[PDB]
């Protein structure tokens, strides 16, 4: 590339996969696409492993509420970066609420094809879609 390249963080993947879920999730249909960071965090902790996901926020976390707030802040920061990437739009007046965009579908490119995960990952990395960590 003549233009530099960069890869999203693993936490960014968590939030993007969750965002795709919310785009496809009908339970939150009442929200009508407008979501708050608190709801996103609640859904994230519901589907992910709370403490083992927290491990990445801080290596010495064991459920401490200070580290809990740290994870909330990290999720908020990743959400802002994704907003910069166009995956999410803050509302014309509110930066605490947002509307999802179809771009989030890229976070599911590893599962859009019904095949073995380990072959699709190699296909994607070969195509340059996704590097490993």
Q: 6 vs 62, which CB is nearer to other proteins?
A: 6
Q: Strand order of the sheet with strand 97-100?
A: 34-36, 97-100, 88-90
Residues that bind other proteins (CB under 8 A): 1-10, 12-14, 17-18, 20-21, 23-24, 26-34, 36, 38, 47-48, 85, 91-94, 96-97, 99, 102, 106-112, 114, 117-118, 121, 124-125, 128-133
CA separation for the pair 42, 71 (Å, rounded)? 12
Q: 62 vs 114, which CB is nearer to other proteins?
A: 114
Q: 70 vs 106, which CB is nearer to other proteins?
A: 106
What's the min distance (Å) between Cβ of 65 and other proteins?
Answer: 12
Q: 5 vs 60, which CB is nearer to other proteins?
A: 5
Angle 96-102-105 from CA coordinates, rounded to 5°:
110
What's the min distance (Å) between Cβ of 128 and other proteins?
Answer: 6
Instruction: Work out the end-to-end distance of the chain between its first and last CA atoms, rounded to an integer number of angstroms.
Output: 20
Closest C-alpha to 68, from 92, 95, 93, 38: 38
What φ, ψ does residue 113 adopt, rounded to 5°? -105, 130
What's the min distance (Å) between Cβ of 37 and other proteins?
Answer: 10
């Amino acid at each position: 590339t003549l233009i530099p390249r960069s890869v999203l963080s693993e936490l960014d993947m968590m939030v993007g996969k969750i965002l795709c879920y919310l785009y496809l999730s009908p339970e939150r249909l009442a929200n009508q696409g407008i979501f708050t960071s608190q709801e996103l965090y609640e859904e994230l902790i519901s589907l992910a492993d709370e403490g083992k996901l927290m491990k990445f926020v801080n290596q010495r976390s064991s459920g401490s509420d200070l580290d809990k707030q740290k994870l909330q802040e990290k999720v908020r920061t990743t959400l802002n970066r994704l907003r910069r990437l166009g995956m999410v739009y803050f509302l014309p007046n509110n930066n605490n609420k947002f509307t999802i965009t179809e771009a989030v579908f890229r976070f599911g490119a590893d599962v859009r094809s019904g095949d073995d995960p380990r072959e699709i990952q190699l296909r994607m990395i070969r195509d340059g879609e996704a590097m490993p960590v």
